[model samples]
Target: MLKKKQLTVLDLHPGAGKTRRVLPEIVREAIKKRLRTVILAPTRVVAAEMEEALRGLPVRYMTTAVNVHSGTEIVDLMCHATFTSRLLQPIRVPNYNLNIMDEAHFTDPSSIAARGYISTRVEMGEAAAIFMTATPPGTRDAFPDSNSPIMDTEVEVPERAWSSGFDWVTDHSGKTVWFVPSVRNGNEIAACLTKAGKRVIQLSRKTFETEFQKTKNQEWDFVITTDISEMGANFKADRVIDSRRCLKPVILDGERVILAGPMPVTHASAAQRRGRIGRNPNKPGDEYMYGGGCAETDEGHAHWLEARMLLDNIYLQDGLIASLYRPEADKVAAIEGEFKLRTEQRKTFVELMKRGDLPVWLAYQVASAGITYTDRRWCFDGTTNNTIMEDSVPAEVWTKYGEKRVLKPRWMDARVCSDHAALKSFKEFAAGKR
Candidate 1:
């Protein structure tokens, strides 16, 4: 049964029936009350997965691909990007009164767009919201006090199975699943493993379904993927590695190189990544699969969060000037100091690229390192009616040579060059002889 009346937060952990019992029941209750409900999932793949799960329910998926929307849809499911875009438009709501944010940890007060979205929905539309996640907020309040006493569902969260390292794969042997930050990273990792006499398959958005369709006996020893399967695909795996690395630009004696940094991960993210391992329902309770993020400190992760918050300021008309509004005096000082400097650098670099000071090849370098735009609408871009969609492209044949060699894509935007080539290009741009 539903817990409290006021704005609720559901902290039901993995294998806890949050998806099976809680979500479906919430939708059913909203429908009974005739309260138009909208669900915000972090990704379209996830939205589609949930839509598939809620089979018989009057659920409608909002997408740019189709208008086959049924008016009878009691529950509206949309990806976070779609919801963010739709929020900027004129007449979305009071269209929806009851809002359910899946992966609710995505709500950040530091995000300018998030603030605008939150203020408008909770304050302007006066809608009731339900925040749901496997790991709920502990340090910060997720929602504003408009719906005070943010009630929790109060479910007991189990201890997560945590595993780490870049060396784990070299020794371990199993049908393990791993997410790399970039396509090239996947290729490079695939190269090493395949050379070690393991059958490794790289899965992309286009190839995941095909790969997942194969029988267990026919499965490869390792599956390397980019986030085409983030919300997960209900596939079975003994482990899922989180490739938590960031691109660090290095310049030495006018020579430049783009390298990966061991970026820190949050406990919430660590918990969620590990949950991806034991996805099969019929599996035994004692069936524990090991996986966790590879990183150093919680303090370092906090700095990254602030950097992200500050970087997001460039998108809004009024920058994230509400930095002063944070209740914690210590965080307010810490965020402003670090956020101010890096934010300055990123903005300058962004403008430099826009001014055509850098060659067009820079985009590929950035893409190779998995550095990209925020989920919020790009205000400075030539077009706002655009989204980077990673198309599923199955490799011709799985091999070390295939994974490392330069490959053509469906388009320039979809291309993934060799790791070496990408870093070289990144260096040239960063060297800035121009």
Candidate 2:
């Protein structure tokens, strides 16, 4: 018989739990060694789900994935894991043991975001990086459907999580389709289905709450909504199809909204609109499609730049893109920051921040709010590439000094240098801020 394989300390299992636990501990140990580690996970939902697992284990989780920012400035300068502020940012706080890029495979090295991440991470002195994936390429073809939920998985509906925002009815077969545009579309569709003896009802975004009170009124083959249908009104349609040339309906959660435009739907627009289906467990098989004359418009043409960027940079998982959608707080801050200096550039910056490669902090600020800043000139120099700034001074000294740097066309201008003591004092004073 072959000799039993030797098991090292690291190889031994600490307890019977999930395989995910093993990597977190390994990550913590590497952090102790000041190794910069980048770990990637399979999905953003799964990535966001890792927060409680890392606490007390000597690892700080930082990402927009959790609907929060846990980066260095927020944790250290504020002196609390949960502490927050609106100042003392745009600086790189250090001592990160490892940089974990969850779902690493999705990040192509050639992608701009991936490249920028590489550059910024190296600059930050990250000692190690660990990329984690439960599904590796070798295993992909071997297990084609490996990522899907099990067939036995039940569809769970939580109580009061949603309401019928539009008029809806279930067919005798319990299938529901929402036709949004007008009661006319709903009634026509309903009329046809009723002729075939399928239970039917008509609905619109203007659908009222009183309509939902009756159980018998709820029976229909489909429900339709209009531009007034918007989203967040919370009417559940198992399937929806939009044929109007002017109305391109973006899907809300838990329902499948299909589009049948004229022809040739742009990849990026299709990508944006595809997110509205199978949002609920029971709704998992919901599908969306773009058909007939879905030609490119001016907006579609404008998105070409982003389309190219998405090709190399953005990660896609399942049918969804792996991304932290541009945050509104970061969006507003960026606009205000620019408008304070020059309004046109402010508008341009807003557009760029939406499509350009913005750092995480800026992205979050822009997407989540309208912010105010006493300083129009941000220290990062992300807006402009300044040769003089790079040639004239050491980065540490430049940012550390309160020499009052001014924003130049493509860089920053540092005048008479401040003393080392002054620079240190400035940094200390700047701490404990937003």
Candidate 3:
């Protein structure tokens, strides 16, 4: 059965205690029972922050945890709780008993990302789902079987999560600042910021690395990037000044990454970027300034109520263990979608490489000679539009196709180093498929 209720922002704010006071007890009990925890956040950086915060406590208590991020650095760590990595890996690091979702309200049908979450839940089981959202999205009508919520229990604490990091350090004024506008406005903003007596470092896809290294070494006060800054690229900018709608800053700890977007930005992007800063527990509420006409599609403001309601877990089941045993239908659907997307990416790669203009050596490197694992185990069974080459060329050619009919590794290597090296990896591998 589903429980319906009204929760104010004050009642839902997790603030400082979620990691220290609240999550520990919840996780401790689950670990004692030998269950794994799954914590999902909206983005890679946010999920990484959560994993880092909770890592010590769970490990101290005989439990283990790891990030679901595809590129987590700590693979040696035992996995008790994971973010989204479960779908990407075939082997489980450890058995999880609980699942936590940060910014849980994004699960509304209106959100494109929600499709993945809903599908994950249906596939996994009646696993314990703890949805932490500042504002829960409410239901417009009765939720169907697929959309039902769990028996939600709300616990409110003072302070927003951002405020937790505010008490950590004093604010500083720096001598240099750089801003980059959209690709078109790049030159103008760079010139203006430089003229203001601040050292400026302007970057785009081409100059991003050299510029980032220069600024990181303290050569300049700031380097402005398009979404490259927002997408998990780290620099020691004590304070970040964001002036665009798309590339909002995600701050961490004592670092002050200020986000300033133009008027009429989307609410979802803003809130997501909001979760970036003030993640540090000691000094939160550093400062967040919103100046603009929010974007209509952004929906952060429009769906605040719904965000609140979804976090309440009105449509989720409490006993996720039963659900995990065979992957509820929903979880299966979610994994299937990911498998499809990966497949499509592979297909795209294959098409572009067929043009012989590409170098052969680059194509071999793109193949990686490693089997990229995907969650859709069933896909391997079907012989569809794309062919699966299960064996390496030298090994397979000599065994089945014979050496005369198949190209050897030397031939492939030579091609990649040639003028055709610029072709995408996917196309090269797809063309090489046996």
Candidate 4:
């Protein structure tokens, strides 16, 4: 329970039982005090988990998956109990006794929309507030209680804990979960494992609900999935395998050499993947790194080296904010020192978001992969290669590019074009040729 006038900032590491333990007491106390409460989580999965965890408490709790545009009735229903989600943005709330925002790092003052949500909540009235996160925000306020540390713990997974032949572990062996970055990746891993005579069940955003329902009561030799398996879902796995290849070590001239490719997941994500294993305290858990599973060919080795540098440089340099549960003290201190400067930098960039333009580095990077944006509302000068909003496709150009519209396919709007010149304009704008 929070003390009167105390603004508790909980920087609890992931899997530290923050939701199951600390959250319950806070909710119970708020209800007992006759204060309305709300739990704001970072995502739907987390919000649902909060709802489940707070079940059977002496509180009238409601879990909403409604949109902010769902109308004011949502705000009306949010009057009582603890409402949860990474949602209800741009909506005002009535007076509440306590407000808990989970994954508080996302609401850092430098962030645009998240700051807006906090503004909306504050505009309503005063409330006892708790900001909980694995990663703390960068800046410190004038208040004495600001930027204080709460519980921080790390689960150490041994480096050599990986193994490819997980099926070799008998029925007595613990369950294993494999993290694939994409649905296709999961399916690919599942197919390869199945073909290799291993038991594998794949889950993706498309099949998560039904598959999870079917398998929640069942056991498999291996479960292949994406981030869906990481947060809030309860399952004890003996091992966790991260299939995304951030860096690869290839055998060149009988020596292992580090190289890089696309697994650009942040350090926190890597930790979260490793974390999936060590959750089952009763049995030892392991995380297997397949190291990109690449051959020692010249081309493959070059790509592997590239990915290695990418991962290592960012992982080491951006250690603090890149990962949610960074246990290194020196790194944390370094981040604290750089916090103000970075906050200012982010604030400067945030302005560009308003103009629908990206930073130079990011724009060029995305352009390398053939991505571009437009604001049709902004006037277009096709002759001069001027950029415009995506929806603002000119009538003459739209007709020539592809007038035919396809409505049968869901999410496939016939308005979009892959025309050669249009693609060129996207690159041209990024190249500053416009």
Candidate 5:
């Protein structure tokens, strides 16, 4: 039963029956040993799903929501997988024989929940703990003191299930589920399907509970949802369509638009969503992924990561440099080049923005070159608490200056007119002197 003296990471395939086959055996064995077991999921939905999945096993179990206020007592064979940060508060390590972290990849040492889990291990002598996840996102190294052994298995998506369009929806006549990125999109798609005479049900964070409550008596042809229901809420469908549109960040306050590139899906999330299908091992689960690709590979995504790293390492004084670390090496050179330029621009912008005041839009434009503001002395704007980025102006500015003064959209127009007049005056002055 004891494989190693440290943490164990299971990198099982999304639909490789880890829960149905592997987990049940461990659970039954733990039961035989008279050890209490706890299965942790990231969300209530996931926890409920696990509870339902393990219902068939001849083991006594209960589900509890992990909240600071709940303060529920621990029991034998319990599943504490709700998505709350207050998990460790009510958990007593000695009470359980085993702790099963179903989506352990979601929590790492940096996470508060992870720190809590690690601390529990100190009190849990000889109590078995197993981490099950489809993708282990750099969490193996999270435990430094313990020798965490990793078990990985490959489960490839069926070739027919992999596509980039919605044609797969038409190909399947049975009940199907479509996963979109937002509630608005879910409603939009539901309307389109409904107009086509197909009965549709849309589930989201707002409607999931009510819809789930009614599901036992209701029936639908199609279900649309966002990732809000991703971690939990199981639906056995003929096919699952992932038509999520990649999102890019955009700044609204300033005149110019600097749009961040497509947000990439973490490998862990991709694996989890894929696992949502194929609940029945005998049935072939089909999936269609739309909107370019689910994984993050674009320069925009790379730049965003590097930007945060650079900000944290240099600006936040965290000691970790941005250009030095990368997930992929192919873009290292490009990222470094962009990082250097951004560092210089930020320096200039911070320098200028700190100087009394300027048009917010113009300041942003100037800050693009590292011009605007700082907390320390005005011009040099060396990294100091006194200097603040124009992008991060204090909310007090609005209260002090009034919203009209702070939000000046016409400043760009004023800047253009001023530039024209200044140019005309300069040309006349030069000609007169000549």
Candidate 6:
């Protein structure tokens, strides 16, 4: 149904049907054309959603998710995590003629692992590529077929508190997704919301799967959660409360605010959160911002730092080989231009990553929270601060390197710049010293 070598940015609204309408439509057509298709997802959840959506449609797909049922794989749903591990070995480029990037904005080359997945596919091309996302990134990106015409949906992004980008929200009418930066924040908000006579269920890493299921039945007035809801999850709500204030906003030069939370809050994320609603056109929704939900005052964007972390802390993969290294007119050219000089920092950081006993990125993360790496272990840094927090990482080469590890870092997304358990433990440890 489509020609070869094209890149279309399916920049639609959150509820506008990237998963349902276009994805299924394209898959059905690709099947008819007898073309081999591959769908790449940023998360396992998204890949599963794509698989479920494509089911009963005569597409033979293979995934590690299920062992028994399978075929020759006319369509294989690949997640980014698995793709990254496969990078060290020579990957067989399936003779596919089409590539689908579900929630494509995650490949904005900010995160360490996504670039490998996307850039690799771009090279394995001649195939028609579709970068699908409700929240499209800026024009500068490294999607392979840069010459192809882009299809973008032009829509106005709604405003928030103080038009301030970060903070909390409310619940009254329909279901609400209350987003917090951490589990503690989620718990506190849940208590307050429930006391205010709003029925709330808080979801955490430990219980998200079971608790997230409850939200589907419309069982609560508010579903207290973190950034997990933003990444291609199908949970719907009438209102989104952005109270990701756990990463306290740091003020710079007494004028500029350097904001960071569990994840990066940028124009892209703010838009994605807003997209949670309005999927049901009848139920128009709102994303409530506290102070500056759209303000990206962080020294580096969240995705970039995350990618840096993966490279430093785990994957020893090529330090992300940033989009800054791309051709003269990369889609991420503007980003490259900005980080051109700062690009040199990778050399210093990578060296430090190797020399330092602690993961360099983790050290930077805990620094702002008053924690520091000293004597080869993480501890609170200060005069009279004399307690060490042992890291869970053992010398098991496979676990240390992540290639043999079955799952990616569990706390990779939400636990940024802060660890409440560590902080609490340090407080008690320091208490004994005093």
- Residue-level lDDT of model 4, residues 63-84, one tens digit each, is 4543223221211222111231
For candidate 4, give the lDDT of residue 167.
Answer: 39
| Best-performing candidate as measured by TM-score | 6
Clashes of 6: 17
Measured with C-alpha atoms, the lDDT of residue 101 in candidate 3 is: 50
lDDT of 5 by residue, 295-405 (tens): 543333323332332222132113322232122223223333233225555444433322323322344354554433432111222233322223355111222212212
TM-score, candidate 1, is 0.55
In candidate 5, stretches whose alpha carbon ends up further than 4 angstroms from where it belongs are: 1-4, 34-36, 45-97, 106-112, 119-128, 138-172, 213-216, 244-262, 278-281, 285-287, 296-434
- Residue-wise C-alpha lDDT for candidate 3, range 1-434, written one tens digit per residue: 01112111211332435544555565556556655554444443344445566665444221222233333222122221122223223333333334555455443221322323433453454334455544333322111111112121111211111234333112335322222334334555555545554466765543454465575565664455543343234443333333424432212221122222433334433333333334444443333333232344333321222222112221233422111112112211122212122333333223222333222122222322223312112112222322223232221222221222222232122122111221233223333432
Query: Which predicted model would earn the best lDDT?
Result: 6
| Stretch of 10 with least lDDT, candidate 1 | 141-150
Query: Per-prediction RMSD in angstroms?
Result: 12.5, 19.0, 16.3, 14.1, 15.3, 11.0
Give per-residue CA lDDT, model 2, range 1-434, as digits (tens).
00112111121111222225765575556556555443433333344445555544443444444544324321211111111111112234443344344332232212223323332334334333333333221221211121112122112211111234312222224344333323444455556556656665544322433343332446555444333222112234434344322232222221112222223333222222222234355545543322223343323221222212322222222332222112101211111112121333333333323333232223223323332232323333434442223336533322344554432211221210122332333233222122
**Evaluation by TM-score, superior candidate among 3 and 6:** 6
Candidate order (TM-score): 6, 1, 5, 4, 3, 2
Candidate 3, residue 159: how far the Cα is off, in Å: 33
Q: Could you give candidate 6's per-residue lDDT for residues 342-364 as a string of tens digits?
A: 22343333332333322323433
- Model with the higher lDDT, candidate 1 or 3: 1
What lDDT would each prediction earn against the true structure?
0.45, 0.31, 0.33, 0.41, 0.43, 0.48
Lowest lDDT 10-mer window, candidate 2?
79-88
lDDT of 3 at 75: 19
lDDT of 2 at 146: 16
- Candidate 4 Cα outliers beyond 4 Å, as residue runs: 1-7, 42-52, 64-92, 95-97, 103-116, 119-125, 135-173, 206-210, 244-261, 285-434
